[PDB]
Design a protein around this nucleic acid. Structure first.
Ligand SMILES: [Cl-]
Ligand SMILES: [Cl-]
Ligand SMILES: [Cl-]
Ligand SMILES: [Cl-]
Ligand SMILES: [Cl-]
Ligand SMILES: [Cl-]
Ligand SMILES: [Cl-]
Ligand SMILES: [Mg+2]
Ligand SMILES: [Mg+2]
Ligand SMILES: [Mg+2]
Ligand SMILES: [Mg+2]
Ligand SMILES: [Mg+2]
Ligand SMILES: [Mg+2]
Ligand SMILES: [Mg+2]
Ligand SMILES: [Mg+2]
Ligand SMILES: [Mg+2]
Ligand SMILES: [Mg+2]
Ligand SMILES: [Mg+2]
Ligand SMILES: [Mg+2]
Ligand SMILES: [Mg+2]
Ligand SMILES: [Mg+2]
Ligand SMILES: [Mg+2]
Ligand SMILES: [Mg+2]
Ligand SMILES: [Mg+2]
Ligand SMILES: [Mg+2]
Ligand SMILES: [Mg+2]
Ligand SMILES: [Mg+2]
Ligand SMILES: [Mg+2]
Ligand SMILES: [Mg+2]
Ligand SMILES: [Mg+2]
Ligand SMILES: [Mg+2]
Ligand SMILES: [Mg+2]
Ligand SMILES: [Mg+2]
Ligand SMILES: [Mg+2]
Ligand SMILES: [Mg+2]
Ligand SMILES: [Mg+2]
Ligand SMILES: [Mg+2]
Ligand SMILES: [Mg+2]
Ligand SMILES: [Mg+2]
Ligand SMILES: [Mg+2]
Ligand SMILES: [Mg+2]
Ligand SMILES: [Mg+2]
Ligand SMILES: [Mg+2]
Ligand SMILES: [Mg+2]
Ligand SMILES: [Mg+2]
Ligand SMILES: [Mg+2]
Ligand SMILES: [Mg+2]
Ligand SMILES: [Mg+2]
Ligand SMILES: [Mg+2]
Ligand SMILES: [Mg+2]
Ligand SMILES: [Mg+2]
Ligand SMILES: [Mg+2]
Ligand SMILES: [Mg+2]
Ligand SMILES: [Mg+2]
Ligand SMILES: [Mg+2]
Ligand SMILES: [Mg+2]
Ligand SMILES: [Mg+2]
Ligand SMILES: [Mg+2]
Ligand SMILES: [Mg+2]
Ligand SMILES: [Mg+2]
Ligand SMILES: [Mg+2]
Ligand SMILES: [Mg+2]
Ligand SMILES: [Mg+2]
Lengths: 50, 207, 124, 149
RNA sequence: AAACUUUCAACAACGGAUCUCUUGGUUCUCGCAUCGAUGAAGAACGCAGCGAAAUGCGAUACGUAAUGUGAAUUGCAGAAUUCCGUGAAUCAUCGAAUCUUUGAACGCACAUUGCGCCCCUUGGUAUUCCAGGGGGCAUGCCUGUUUGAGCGUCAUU
RNA sequence: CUAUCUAGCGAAACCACAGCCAAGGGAACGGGCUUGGCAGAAUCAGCGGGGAAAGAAGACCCUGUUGAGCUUGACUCUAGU
RNA sequence: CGUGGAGGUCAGUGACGAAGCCUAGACCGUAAGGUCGGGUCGAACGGCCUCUAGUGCAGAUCUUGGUGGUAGUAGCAAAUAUUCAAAUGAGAACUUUGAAGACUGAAGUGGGGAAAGGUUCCACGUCAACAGCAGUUGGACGUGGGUUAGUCGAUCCUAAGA
RNA sequence: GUCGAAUUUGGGUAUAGGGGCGAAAGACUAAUCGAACCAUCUAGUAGCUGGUUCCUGCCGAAGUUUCCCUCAGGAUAGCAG
RNA sequence: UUGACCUCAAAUCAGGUAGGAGUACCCGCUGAACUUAAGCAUAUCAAUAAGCGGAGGAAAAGAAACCAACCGGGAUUGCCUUAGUAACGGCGAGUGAAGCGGCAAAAGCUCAAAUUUGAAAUCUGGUACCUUCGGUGCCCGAGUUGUAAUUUGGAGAGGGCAACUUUGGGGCCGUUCCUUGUCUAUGUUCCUUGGAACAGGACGUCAUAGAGGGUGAGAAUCCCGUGUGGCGAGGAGUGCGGUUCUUUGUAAAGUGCCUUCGAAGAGUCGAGUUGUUUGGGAAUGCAGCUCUAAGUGGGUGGUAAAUUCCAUCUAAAGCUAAAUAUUGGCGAGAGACCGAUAGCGAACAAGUACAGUGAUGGAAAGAUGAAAAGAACUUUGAAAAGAGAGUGAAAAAGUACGUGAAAUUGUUGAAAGGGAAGGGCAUUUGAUCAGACA
């Protein structure tokens, strides 16, 4: 809701920044097996549960 | 591991739900939920009769009966037919048993040790070991057992003045003190007729 | 044969130590033998590979070609020669990775540290 | 669970016995450790014989009283009869047991003789620190064996 | 007679068995004895030229200092003077430092980034009001210091 | 408004193998066995006779030296008093 | 008879192709099985004498995974309702604009909030997947922007209670 | 059916598993109640149901006796190798 | 009034200390039931799981109020044995030690109770200085309601007499121990196959080095290492092997004979009773309550009691290495172990994704090639892509990637089909195929 504590807002801020695709240049590194971000989140599919 | 296959809180669903009565993982939301557990027929379960460390490994053998086998093995080394039938290249060896001079016990270098062995007729047996090196034929290759080869001559001495070090690097050749002869070396694979080269001092000490 | 209790013959341990070796230890692993002319001149058998070293290829499809070491790619366990490259279909050129054990050093880049290493190994 | 002509068995395995199974896989390893410990102690301690001299005593009980064996230590009366004090005896490699008493003259005489022979076959180095090097004998028991009278 | 149905073969699908591979697991043996109020284990939030995670680190933030090795790092860009040298490095070693908010957690509180007190100092025409910077204030117990209480009690006025 | 036909989209129950009858004998009520009646591709909309149709290791009843809830001067105990 | 591993031996087979797999092609054995040719394939593997076992599957409403018939079938029918033209686009019953016909009918399908959610808000770009038809559209995908308080709340007070 | 009250309801707070709560139905206590949910003891026991993996060769049964809280089970003798 | 003493407080007083984590092994407390007895209550499971308190590298135990009955042994712990024995037990099911004997390891000790009394001789702290894990001087304080020296039962102490014997505390350099560094052999010589030689053939070399790994396929001799030795660097502990500076000290200890003495632990031992526990049985240990000692005494001597002897130790206070334990932590070496549905749940950004209000529950998922050389360019299409071309040893390796089985499916070819299909014996027809031409 609009009324939120500082702890909740700080928690929400980190979850927003962690929700992004992997940079392309990382896949070109030597010995790289990572293709897609397996920890991607959508607000309607999986809830944070704070 | 004693805990393998039992790190689960699975419980049987009972009858009436149209499934087998095997215990099943509780909860939900992972795919592992509802799967069978604890059974020897279940994926990720416990094997039937898990192996234990207190299985018998070593075997007792009567001391006198053990010496009977050792004496039989020593006597078999003096029979040319048995030595030949065990795969040793002793076709043109002059006399079996083969006794060489005591100075063989004082050889310090590998090069001169090999030359002495070749001079008494062991050249063909040494070449057999080199030409028989092969890669193992199963999963033992990556269990630190990667190569196999034949067994060569056995050199028996009375006193060690450098002979053991000189023959250490020669493939297939092993040395043994006359006082502590080993049945595992005299009859490899439980097959009699090992090719044995005796020194003069060791041959006398047999009495 | 092995005679010490501090050394292990385990294949699994040996391979893990090779593939996880740090950069400093890969320098020793990337050593190359000297040529006959240099072996007699200095009196040593092999040295760790160094940039700006003249080498000759003695194995593979690139046997007979020479050049200077332009990059020691420790992360890939390989070195690259300036004039040993491959031409792509689009016209671009890429270096060819070579293992130093398949090369022969024909000229050494010398400085204060390299000379001391040669004398440390009994060379002249 | 009773059938056929068989002996009655008394196998005691109704507890959680599998949790308390001890297999001596390290029998060979412990022998190596003990030999290493004896070797390092002999070098470390002194040219001393690595063990203390023991007296000869009569085994108790009517079943074993026909044999003599090694006791714990010499009595206060035995060491006094040999011409030395208990405190000095401990520092020269003689075990002293204050709670054993002497009632047999034959045992008392035998233990006195052992102490006499021990003092004549050892060299006590001075406290100055010269300490001339001497060969180390590793077993005082082997040097002074016990014989049945 | 076609279509359709069924059986077999070839080629193509579907699916991931089989074979070979292994920086993992498991068991046995040997050696050693080192967490924390000098703030531990754990938690939260941050830190890279281009990074979400893992790994590393703490506003000195994928690191600072020191020692060793002696020329890299590398996906791209960049920096080049760092190359016969107090000196390259996502190197090794590691004895000097930094170490946000927390946590046994210690000014009081905490579903709050809530609310006090003391010392030094700076600014606002200021010992008292407001603000910035630095340093402090938990409990039980032990030894000692100092200040005290009780006709419990002594001696002397 | 469906059903129905077309374009697009597109599951599930269930499934030993399967699917025409009469009598016979048979585990005393056959789709198969025996003897007869018969029997011709591929199919659409309906239909509830049959498939002893599907849904659940019968809640009824009995057995087990298997339980639990409840009651009582059953056996043996116990907090409190 | 066959399978994993172990000691011995055949100085056994092999990148001039080991193992595996396919093959209404051939041969041996009463059988368990063994051998050969052809195709595919790419790095190890077998005979014999012995040792050892986590050693042989059609079933257990067996475990895990994969795949069928059913079947292009059941169905995609509550909430009155859509139509014409232009624009855009490879493509329009469904996007945008205009026109028309309608509904919610102020205890609303209107205009704000508490809890709960957490960037879904806004612009640009874009359609493989998702919106059980469609899609140029979107709460989708990619990249950015955006929440400003001495007076509104929290903070302070006490309630049942802790 | 009821609709100004023994009314309806938000938030705060109290009562926790042989315990709670009950205008009392063994009702309710997070789709769970004639004793919740979670982990462990636990691979709990089962005279009861189901299953139990290669070939060939030779031999080849029993449902009967006695005892048993024995009657879907054992011991014992017999039959078999 | 003043100044002490006793007891009790305060301070953000000076300096310290305790908490939490980990917990495999160790020392205690608390404490079940499933199960077995073919039922079941004593019993059994079990003095176990769970719960709670407390340590270390080990812990605990430990120098006899022991075992014995013998010609006696002699701290503790562990192994072999005693022994499935004595004994316990609805004497049912079941349970169950100890002494001796062999061995591993060995090590002993000190407080209380005495007048220093011709001298509190003892100690914390503060302060100055110094050779700083401490020392000295000085000043307060603690303490006579007892701090040192002296003595602990094996003894020992106060006197008298007569004799010799025996040293203490540091520096330096070596050695030992641990943590590390560096140096120290021999072919890439010819022919064939291959994309690649590390394969095959020929000819050599080293070997106290033919362990292991890497490098374009099976490499002792290409690289790292391996084997044997050499030369360094930094610490720990005084364990000792040498040298060196101090005389500790009218100090301290040991030993003979004579004489007088010889202090030794209380609500404790022991007894009754109740509960629990043990193989311990007229009662093994532990605990509650009641009673409550002795000094030629007291405990024990495995059947209760009275009486008479004997044996053996010395409780009610304390410390102490090694042999023993170890599913935790750190560092190593291994296997007739498993080989991606196996082996730890996890060989991968795994205690991760995800589920539950919560305690908790908990996956799936490894392999292009030697090297991306990851397909320039042309053409069709709105595009995805297709058809060519090209790279490679191989696209029958194209980021849906090694090998690529079965179920199931498409195309092509052959054959049969009047309410199933499949099978056995025999032969016709079609297709297809081995064997001898001696
Ligand atoms: Cl919000
Ligand atoms: Cl086993
Ligand atoms: Cl091979
Ligand atoms: Cl056969
Ligand atoms: Cl609760
Ligand atoms: Cl792991
Ligand atoms: Cl849950
Ligand atoms: Mg979104
Ligand atoms: Mg939702
Ligand atoms: Mg498993
Ligand atoms: Mg014997
Ligand atoms: Mg195989
Ligand atoms: Mg009919
Ligand atoms: Mg009938
Ligand atoms: Mg039927
Ligand atoms: Mg019929
Ligand atoms: Mg018929
Ligand atoms: Mg019907
Ligand atoms: Mg039933
Ligand atoms: Mg039922
Ligand atoms: Mg019955
Ligand atoms: Mg009952
Ligand atoms: Mg093949
Ligand atoms: Mg076939
Ligand atoms: Mg390959
Ligand atoms: Mg099996
Ligand atoms: Mg079969
Ligand atoms: Mg099957
Ligand atoms: Mg079967
Ligand atoms: Mg099934
Ligand atoms: Mg339809
Ligand atoms: Mg409908
Ligand atoms: Mg409608
Ligand atoms: Mg209306
Ligand atoms: Mg209207
Ligand atoms: Mg929007
Ligand atoms: Mg759609
Ligand atoms: Mg679409
Ligand atoms: Mg009722
Ligand atoms: Mg429920
Ligand atoms: Mg079972
Ligand atoms: Mg017959
Ligand atoms: Mg039955
Ligand atoms: Mg203070
Ligand atoms: Mg304990
Ligand atoms: Mg029972
Ligand atoms: Mg039973
Ligand atoms: Mg019962
Ligand atoms: Mg416990
Ligand atoms: Mg510790
Ligand atoms: Mg120890
Ligand atoms: Mg201790
Ligand atoms: Mg004593
Ligand atoms: Mg003893
Ligand atoms: Mg018991
Ligand atoms: Mg108890
Ligand atoms: Mg008696
Ligand atoms: Mg009695
Ligand atoms: Mg103690
Ligand atoms: Mg797994
Ligand atoms: Mg191929
Ligand atoms: Mg493939
Ligand atoms: Mg198929």
């Amino acid at each position: 809701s609009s009324h939120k504590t500082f702890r909740i807002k700080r928690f929400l801020a980190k979850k927003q920044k962690q929700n992004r695709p992997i940079p392309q240049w990382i896949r070109m590194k030597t010995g790289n097996k990572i293709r897609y971000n397996s920890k991607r989140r959508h607000w309607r599919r999986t809830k944070l549960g704070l | 591991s004693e805990k393998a296959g039992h790190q689960t809180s699975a419980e049987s669903w009972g009858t009436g739900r149209a499934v087998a009565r095997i215990p099943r993982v509780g909860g939900g939301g992972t795919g592992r939920s509802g799967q069978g557990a604890f059974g020897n027929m279940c994926r990720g379960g416990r094997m039937f009769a898990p192996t234990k460390t207190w299985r018998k490994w070593n075997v007792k053998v009567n001391h006198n009966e053990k010496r009977y086998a050792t004496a039989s093995a020593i006597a078999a080394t003096a029979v040319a037919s048995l030595v030949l039938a065990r795969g040793h290249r002793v076709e043109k060896i002059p006399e079996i048993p083969l006794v060489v001079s005591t100075d063989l016990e004082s050889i310090q270098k590998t090069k001169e040790a090999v030359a002495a062995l070749k001079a008494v007729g062991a050249h063909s047996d040494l070449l057999k070991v080199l030409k028989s090196k092969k890669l193992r034929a199963g999963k033992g290759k990556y269990r630190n057992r990667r190569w196999t080869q034949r067994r060569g001559p056995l050199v028996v001495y009375a006193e060690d003045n450098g002979i053991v070090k000189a023959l250490r690097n020669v493939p297939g050749v092993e040395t043994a003190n006359v006082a502590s002869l080993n049945l595992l070396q005299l009859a490899p694979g439980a097959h009699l007729g090992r090719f044995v080269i005796w020194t003069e001092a060791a041959f006398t000490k047999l009495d | 044969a092995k005679q010490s209790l501090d050394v292990s013959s385990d294949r699994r341990k040996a391979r893990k130590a090779y593939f996880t070796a740090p950069s400093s230890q890969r320098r020793v692993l990337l050593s190359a033998p000297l040529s006959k002319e240099l072996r007699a001149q200095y009196g040593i058998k092999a040295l760790p590979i160094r940039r700006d070293d003249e080498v000759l290829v003695v194995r593979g499809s690139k046997k007979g070609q020479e050049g200077k070491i332009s990059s020691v790619y420790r992360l890939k366990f390989a070195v690259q020669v300036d004039k040993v490259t491959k031409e792509k279909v689009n016209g671009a050129s890429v270096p060819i990775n070579l293992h130093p054990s398949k090369l022969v050093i024909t000229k050494l880049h010398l400085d204060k540290d390299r000379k001391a290493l040669i004398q440390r190994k009994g060379g002249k | 669970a009773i059938s056929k002509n068989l002996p009655i068995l008394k196998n005691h395995f109704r507890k959680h016995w599998q949790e308390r199974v001890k297999v001596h896989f390290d029998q060979a390893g412990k022998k190596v450790s003990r030999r290493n410990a004896r070797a390092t102690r002999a070098a470390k301690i002194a040219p001393r014989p690595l063990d203390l001299l023991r007296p000869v005593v009569r085994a108790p009980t009517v079943k074993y009283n026909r044999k003599v064996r090694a006791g714990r230590g010499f009595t206060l009366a035995e060491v006094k009869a040999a011409g030395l004090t208990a405190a000095y005896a401990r520092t020269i490699g003689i075990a002293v047991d204050h709670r054993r008493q002497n009632r047999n003259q034959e045992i008392f005489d035998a233990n006195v003789q052992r102490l006499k022979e021990y003092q004549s076959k050892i060299i006590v180095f001075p406290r100055n620190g010269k300490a001339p090097e001497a060969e180390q004998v590793l077993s005082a028991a082997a040097t002074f064996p016990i014989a049945q009278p």
